[PDB]
Every structure is written in C-alpha cells, then in structure tokens.
C-alpha cells in the first residue's frame, strides 16, 4: 500500500452544524443538450464537420440534476467557530452509470454568503468533493453515510489548485465530534484562507488534513494528484466505470471554453462502484471576509441515443436526446 502521510494528531474533530434549510435554494440550471451540456466526447475516434447518431452515456434533456452548495462557517469577528454545512453526508445516492457535474456556473455574478443570507458577495468557483464506493451503511450513532471497505475519495485541495484521488479504507476516528466519537453530526472538510490561502503558499494539504481528522486512511492502493490552473471559467467534470476501472473526465484540458468532456485519468478501482455522496466543505473564514461559492450540479448518466453535431473544429456544439419525444426521434433520423 501507499504512504499517504501521517494521521491527524488532533484529539478531536471540529464541531459541525448542519442546517439544510440554508442550502435549499432554487437556482435552476438544467441540462440543455442543444448547447452540448453534459456531453462526454465519444471515445476511440474523433469526428469533424458531421452529424452522427451515437449510443452512449448521456444526461437527459432538461434534467435539473441535484444542486450542492458550500458555505463559509460560523465566525465571531476574527474567530472561526463551528463548520456550517448541508446534510449531504447522510444523502447516499446510487452511482448506476456515473454522472457529470456542472462546476462554477454562477461565478462572477452576485450571490449570497449562505450563512449570512443578507450579506452578498461576488460568486467564486469551488470544486466538488465526492465519496464513492461499493458498500455503505450507518455510523454507530445510526447516522447514514458510512462507506465500508475501500472507498474512492475525490478531494480538491490547495485552494482549488489541485485534485486528489485516493482509494483507502476510511477508519472513523473516535475523538469528540468524530464519526466514532462523542456528539457526531456530520463529517466535513474545511480550509482556513487566512493561513491556508495567502499568495505563493497555498497549503496543498489543508483539505486532506481536515479529512484525516474524521477518518484514518488505511491500506491505500493509490493517491493521485492533478494540478489545476486557477480561473473562474465554468467547467464540466464526469465519472464513469468499466471493467478497466474508474474514468475521470474534464473539459479543462481539451475544451476549456466549450465544455466537451475528455478522459484525463483511469483509476485502478475494479470493485463495482454502487454508491456515492457529496462531501460537505465549509470555509473557515472570519466574518468580514466571507465569500460566496458557486453551486455545483450533478446529473446522472444513462444509456441513450443522441444525435451529435460536430463543428469543423472537431467539437460537439449541439446534440439531440432522441428518446425525449416522438419529434426528437425523427430529428435524429435527419
């Protein structure tokens, strides 16, 4: 197994306040495949200046998906306090065929800081974190959201300048507020901008260290790091699984401005991924420096027939979900 660094030496976990109702907003961003939302590029062959019919894994037209939001944590003036999160860790969802993710759509526009709904701020992109695995259950106090055996964790870090992917056993820790300890509400990750995100010194392990406060990492088969260029550009992220492993897709390298998703990693994860959950993250800022973080949207993939329209440049810029209605079926037959 891989060395993933020392365990947390902290005697306890940070207290976590779950207030789902502050995170239940209707900020609708549904799939529009006529703009090629949520399209993974067909693998094995490229196409150019042509319209084809293709069977693959696609979102359905108009799917609202599931929205997730991250928030600044509690703070009194200069002192951060409890984390502040939604109930995402208890909401385990079925992986099925995988999913695609709309990231940073609201960035640059005016938004709310969540924890203080009247305080407004310019929305900034934030990356989602995921927990995926093949066996789930409950923590000792009965709360849902526990992943057993080897679990895949996708965890951004470094103030959004890297992504970590690792496959380890998650051993819940036993200190106060930890998942096998006293007064457990939810696990969460966090970072502290004042000491984690000044210029030229981004802590590449802030989020990982906060994760290690809730779980000891055991028998880790791999830990991969992917560097991220910093910007406010919206992007798409996807994940599927085949017998060859878990496949990670992004728009960033090949189609940064257009959103087409291409595979950038294959993970040696060969147990069938059946469940996933969104890992809550809370930003430990002081009151006067809270930011607004853009919501991310997850949409499930299913085997569907799409008409795909490729531009001269080779990119998909328009598609048709043929099974949407009778008229769409005939459009796909040209």
């Amino acid at each position, epitope marked *: 197994y891989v060395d993933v660094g020392p365990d947390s030496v*902290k*005697s*306890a976990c940070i207290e976590v306040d779950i207030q789902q109702t502050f995170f239940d907003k209707t900020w609708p961003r549904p799939i529009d495949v006529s703009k090629a939302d949520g399209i993974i590029y067909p693998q094995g062959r490229t196409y150019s200046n042509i319209t084809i019919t293709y069977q693959g894994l696609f979102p359905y037209q108009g799917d609202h998906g599931d929205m997730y939001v991250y928030s600044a944590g509690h703070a009194t003036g200069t*002192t951060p306090q409890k984390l502040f999160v939604a109930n995402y860790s208890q909401d385990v969802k079925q992986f099925a065929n995988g999913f695609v993710v709309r990231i940073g759509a609201a960035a640059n526009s005016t938004g709310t800081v969540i924890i203080s709904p009247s305080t407004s701020a310019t929305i900034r992109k934030i990356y989602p974190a995921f927990m995926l695995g093949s066996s789930v259950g409950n923590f000792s106090d009965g709360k849902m959201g526990r992943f057993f055996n080897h679990t895949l964790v996708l965890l951004p870090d470094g103030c959004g300048t890297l992504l970590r992917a690792f496959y380890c056993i998650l051993e819940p*820790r*036993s*200190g106060n507020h*930890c998942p096998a300890g*006293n007064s457990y509400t939810s696990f969460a990750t966090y970072h502290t901008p004042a000491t984690d995100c000044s210029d030229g010194n981004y802590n590449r392990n802030a989020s990982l260290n906060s994760f290690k406060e809730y779980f000891n990492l055991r028998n880790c088969t791999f830990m991969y790091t992917y560097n991220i260029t910093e910007d406010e550009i919206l992007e798409w992220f996807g994940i599927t699984q085949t017998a060859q492993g878990v496949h990670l897709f992004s728009s960033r390298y090949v189609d940064l401005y257009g959103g087409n998703m291409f595979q950038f990693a294959t993970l040696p994860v060969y147990d069938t991924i059946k469940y996933y959950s969104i890992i809550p993250h809370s930003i430990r800022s002081i009151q006067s420096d809270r930011k607004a973080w853009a919501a991310f949207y997850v949409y499930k993939l299913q085997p569907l027939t799409f008409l795909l329209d490729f531009s001269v440049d080779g990119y998909i810029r328009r598609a048709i979900d043929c099974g949407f209605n009778d008229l769409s079926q005939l459009h796909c037959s040209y």
Partner: antibody, heavy 118, light 112 residues
Framework: QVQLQQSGGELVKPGASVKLSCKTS????????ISWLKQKPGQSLEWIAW????????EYNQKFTGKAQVTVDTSSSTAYMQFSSLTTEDSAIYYC???????????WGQGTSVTVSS | QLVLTQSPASLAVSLGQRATISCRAS??????????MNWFQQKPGQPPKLLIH???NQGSGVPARFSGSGSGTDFSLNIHPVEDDDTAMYFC?????????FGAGTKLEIKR
C-alpha cells in the same frame, strides 16, 4: 455517587499478560470517554489510551501500540485494559479515568498496582 | 510529542499567600482563544484530582483559590490564599493533541 472501582494489584513475570478492569457507577457510561494512564513512583503520568464507551472507538499512545488493548462491556459499565508482553519497565500504578479526547479527566479510579518481576 | 515544561520544579509558600505555577507548551495549544489545557493536583497515595479545564474553567466543586489562565503556549495556575492542605504535586496537561501529555509536575510545599 460517582465511582470508578479498579481491580486488585497483580504480580506477573516478564512476558506475561494482565487484564485490568474498572467498574463504573453513578454516571452515564455509554456517552463518556474512559482513559487508562500509567504512573511510576516519583514520576509524572503517562496516558496510554482512551475508548469512547458508546461506540467502542479507541485511540492509543503509539508507544503502547501492540501491548495495550482497551475494551468496554457497556452492559456492566466496565472498562478493561489487556496488557501483554510485560517488561519490568511496565511496573507502575495504572489508573482508569473518565475523560479522553478534548474532555478533561474529571473522575479517577483508585489505581491498580502492577509489578512485573521474576 | 507535545511537550509541556512546568516552572518552577518546586516552591514553598506561607499560609495565605499566592502560589504561581506556569506551564509552557512546545507548540500552540490554543484554537482561536480556547485552549484544552488542564491542571491537576495529586496528593501522596491518591489519584490526581482535576482542578482546571480548558485553561480557565474550574472543575466541579474545586475551591475558588485555584485559578487558571493563559492562552497559546503559556498558562499559569494560581493558588491564593494557599492553605495547609494544598501541599501536593501539580501537573499541567494538554488535551489538544494525541498523545495526551502531562507536565513533569511542580511540588508545592507549605512554609511554617
């Protein structure tokens, strides 16, 4: 009244094992931390391990990993510590205390004397 | 790994006067003002007794003459007015990092 009642002193030869117990009363066992600690005469205290009785979750001093195992029986509000591979350096008084993680140890057992000698 | 150095190793105080024991942690115990620092008294043949927790909060039933203060790396236990039963060992102890560690102890003796 709050009571942590530790088992009687033991003399054991080097290499032997001992199981110390700590029968508790007068407070909610299932929601408290139980810690075990070591003290040699004239010396400060050394924390060995804790267990959260409600879940069985444990945290160990890595100096004692492989030699100490703490368990609880929640039906009798009793904490146990199994000590194995004992050395003459393990001769000391051993305490159970209620406390652990960030909770200060506020109630203490009377102590169990362990002598490791041939 | 987190080391607490107490000062002084011993001290002798007359009845009714102040005793001041200080504890310095090698790294910072504080988390934005709240420090998991405890103080204990131990008399001969007895288990320790909790005096102070979280730096400055008194244990249940602990006489008001024992008081704790400090933050970050520096803490102190003040005993005033000192009484004859206060002759004992005093230990600081941190509960912020694993392994939990104690100071080496300060012996308080009463002058007569």
């Amino acid at each position: 009244q709050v009571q942590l009642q530790q088992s009687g002193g033991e003399l054991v030869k080097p290499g032997a094992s001992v199981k110390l117990s700590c029968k508790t009363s007068g407070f909610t066992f299932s929601s408290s931390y139980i810690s075990w600690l070591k003290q040699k005469p004239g010396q400060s205290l050394e924390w060995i391990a804790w267990i959260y009785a409600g879940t069985g979750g444990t945290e160990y001093n890595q100096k004692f990993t492989g030699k100490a195992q703490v368990t609880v029986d929640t039906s009798s509000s009793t904490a146990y510590m199994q000590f194995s591979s004992l050395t003459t350096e393990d001769s000391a008084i051993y305490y159970c205390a209620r406390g652990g993680s960030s909770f200060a140890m506020d109630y203490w057992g009377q102590g169990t004397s362990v002598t490791v000698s041939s | 790994q987190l080391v607490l150095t107490q000062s002084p190793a011993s001290l002798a105080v007359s009845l009714g006067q102040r005793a001041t024991i200080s504890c310095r942690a090698s790294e910072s115990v504080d988390n934005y003002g709240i420090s998991f620092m405890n103080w204990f008294q131990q008399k001969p043949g007895q288990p320790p007794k909790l005096l102070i927790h979280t730096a400055s909060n008194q244990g249940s039933g602990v006489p008001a003459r024992f008081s704790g203060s400090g933050s970050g790396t520096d803490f102190s236990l003040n005993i005033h007015p000192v009484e004859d039963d206060d002759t004992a060992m005093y230990f600081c102890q941190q509960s912020e990092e694993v392994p939990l560690t104690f100071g080496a102890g300060t012996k308080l003796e009463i002058k007569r």
